[PDB]
Amino acid sequence: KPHLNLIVIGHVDHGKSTLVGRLLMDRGFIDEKTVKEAEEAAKKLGKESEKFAFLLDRLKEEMRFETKKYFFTIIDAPGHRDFVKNMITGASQADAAILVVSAKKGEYEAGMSVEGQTREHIILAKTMGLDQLIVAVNKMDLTEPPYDEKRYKEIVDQVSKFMRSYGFNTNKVRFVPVVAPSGDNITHKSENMKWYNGPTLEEYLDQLELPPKPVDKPLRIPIQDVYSISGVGTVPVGRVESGVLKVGDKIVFMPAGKVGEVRSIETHHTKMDKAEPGDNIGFNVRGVEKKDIKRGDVVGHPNNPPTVADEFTARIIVVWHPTALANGYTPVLHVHTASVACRVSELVSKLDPRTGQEAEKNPQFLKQGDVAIVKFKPIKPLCVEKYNEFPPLGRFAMRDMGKTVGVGIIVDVKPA
C-alpha cells in the first residue's frame, strides 16, 4: 500500500483534532498500554465515549492510519512552527488534505468570512496543489434540526462557488456530511443522514489518485558531464529525472536549443536500448557540438523542451545570513546539476512562517529565518522548472561563502 502524507485544515474549533483523533482510533496504531488505560477509564466512568476522550488527550500529549488502499501519515497543519520552512525544504510535504468545515450556525459563517481560516486554508490548499481536497462538513448533529440536509447543501454550494472563484478546480473536490466524535460518515455509514447517498470520508480517501509518475512526464535529463570520444562522438552524461530516452530519439539541449539524435545509451559500461527515471547514463548524440553542451544544461524531447528562465519566482527560507539580504543580492544557486549566480530581482513579500499567508509586502530586506516570495534573474541562461511540475528541477539552494544561505522552491517561471 502506497504511503501518503495527509494534512487536516480548517477553522479553529471546527473539529480537526477530533476528526484526526477519530481516524487514529478507528484505523491507526495506538499502543496496547494506551488503549488498555483508555478502556480502563471508560469502564470506571461507565461511559463508552470516555475511551475516545482518553485517547484524544493522549494523542494531544504527544499518527499513521490505514485504509483499504493506503497508509496515511498525519502531518503538521498550518499554524505550527516551521510549517512553511518544512514544505520548502521538503522535510514535510502534503499528498492530500481534508478541510473540516463546521455546519453549526455561526461557526460555518465565521470560518468562511474575510478573516476566517476556512477561506484562508482553501486558498492555501490551492497554493499547495491539493486539487483532490475532501471537505468534511462536520458537527452535522448540531444543525437546527440535527442532521439537516438543507444546511449541508447550502454549505457545499457556497464553498464550491468560492473554490471555483479561486481557480481551485472542483471536479476532484468531494464533500461528505460527518460527525467527528462518533465516526458518522467517516469510518462507517451514518444511520442519521439517510438523505446522504455518497461515499464515507474513508471511502473518499481510498478514491484518491496518486500523482503522475516521473516516467510518464516529459523527458528531462540534467547534464553532469560531457565527453568527446574519438570516432564515437559527443557523449553527455546525466541522470534521467523524468520521461524515457530511447536510441533513435531526437533530443534538444537547452539553453542552447540544439537538436541531435541519440545513437547509443549506456549505464555501467553496458549498452541499453532505453533509459528511464533514475538511470544515470552516457548517451552518444549525433549532430551537436560539444561546445553547445555543458554541465547544468538540460536535455528533453523537441516537443517539450526544458524551460529556460529569463526570471523565476520562488518561495524561500533564509536559513543562514550574518546580516541582511536585499534586492540585487547575487548568490550562486545550485539547482539540479547547475550552479549559476542569480540576482535577487524583487523581494515580493515575506510570509507568515506558521501559515504561508503574506505578512509584509515588498520588504526592504530579508534576514535569517525569514520566509518569502522572491524573484530571481539568472546572470546567464538557466534551465529550471516549477517545483510542482518537475520537482528535481524546481528546488534549489542559495550558496555563499561555502554555506547554504537559503533553500527555495520555484513557483513561476518567465520563460526566455
Ligand X SMILES: Nc1nc2c(ncn2[C@@H]2O[C@H](COP(=O)(O)OP(=O)(O)O)[C@@H](O)[C@H]2O)c(=O)[nH]1
CA atoms of 309 and 325, how far apart (whole Å): 22
Cell (9 digits) for 47: 461511559
The single residue among 67, 138, 185, 355 that binds ligand X, judged by CB under 6 A, is 138
Which letter does DSSP use for residue 216 in this model? Answer: G
> What's at 349, amino acid-wise?
S
Question: ω into residue 391 within 30 of 0, thus cis?
Answer: no
Site membership for ligand X, residue 120 (CB under 6 A): no
Specify the residue, 139 or 350, whose C-beta has the smaller distance to ligand X: 139
β-pairing verdict for 395-400 and 338-351: unpaired
Give how far Cα 188 sits from Cα of 15, 141, 196, Å.
Answer: 18, 16, 13
Nearest residue to Mg ion, using CB? 17
CA atoms of 382 and 298, how far apart (whole Å): 9
The single residue among 1, 3, 12, 412 that binds ligand X, judged by CB under 6 A, is 12
Which letter does DSSP use for residue 63 in this model? Answer: -
| 3-state SS record for 64-133 | EEECCCCEEEECCCCCCCCHHHHHHHCCCCCCEEEEEEECCCCHHHHHCCCCCHHHHHHHHHHHCCCCCC
Specify the residue, 183 or 356, whose C-beta has the smaller distance to ligand X: 183
Number of residues that bind Mg ion (CB under 5 A): 1
The single residue among 4, 6, 15, 255 that binds ligand X, judged by CB under 6 A, is 15
Q: How far is the CB of 10 from ligand X (least distance, A)?
A: 6
Specify the residue, 107 or 249, whose C-beta has the smaller distance to ligand X: 107
Q: How far is the CB of 98 from Mg ion (least distance, A)?
A: 13
The single residue among 137, 163, 180, 382 that binds ligand X, judged by CB under 6 A, is 180
Site membership for Mg ion, residue 5 (CB under 5 A): no
CA atoms of 15 and 136, how far apart (whole Å): 9
Specify the residue, 30 or 259, whose C-beta has the smaller distance to ligand X: 30
Site membership for Mg ion, residue 17 (CB under 5 A): yes
Name the segment binding ligand X (CB under 6 A); options: 14-22, 198-206, 290-298, 354-362. 14-22
Number of residues that bind ligand X (CB under 6 A): 15
SS3 309: strand
Specify the residue, 10 or 296, whose C-beta has the smaller distance to ligand X: 10
Site membership for ligand X, residue 139 (CB under 6 A): yes
Question: ω into residue 331 within 30 of 0, thus cis?
Answer: no
Provide the binding-site residues for ligand X, judged by CB under 6 A.
Answer: 10, 12-18, 138-139, 141-142, 179-181
